[PDB]
């Protein structure tokens with residue numbers, strides 16, 4: 001099993017969230033709301049308006065997302081769902097846990113290591129596209145995700 005930080009179309013309310021809940025693919029259980037500890041550029045790019053976490057830590061913005069506990073069946077599914085390693089790569093990062101209420105002695109941990117689907121090789125100009133802190137297909141940019149061909 002592993003923890004995966006999702007920031008794009010897999011989040012609750014987003015167009016591919018269903019694939020986490022299709023038990024043919026294994027299990028995924030929501031653990032927490034999170035925010036990356038380091039900033040990355042998160043951009044909407046290409047004809048399908050897909051979101052890409054560019055692997056440029058230390059630039060961009062802190063990225064909001066959701067932490068899921070997944071089994072190995074679900075992780076293998078997701079790796080193929082994301083066309084890894086050719087398109088995205090599964091890398092690791094640390095995420096700040098966001099609680100419903102601000103914070104006891106000893107205090108609760110506030111970070112966790114997760115896998116994430118990031119992209120290392122891209123048209124360089126993508127790095128100058130608008131940077132997002134929270135992706136929404138139906139967000140104010142108007143660039144709706146569309147898997148059509």
Ligand SMILES: O=C1CC[C@@H](C(=O)O)N1
Pocket residue numbers: 005006007008009010011050051052053082117
């Ligand atoms: O659309 C996307 C980007 C990577 C994955 C996610 O939600 O994290 N799906």
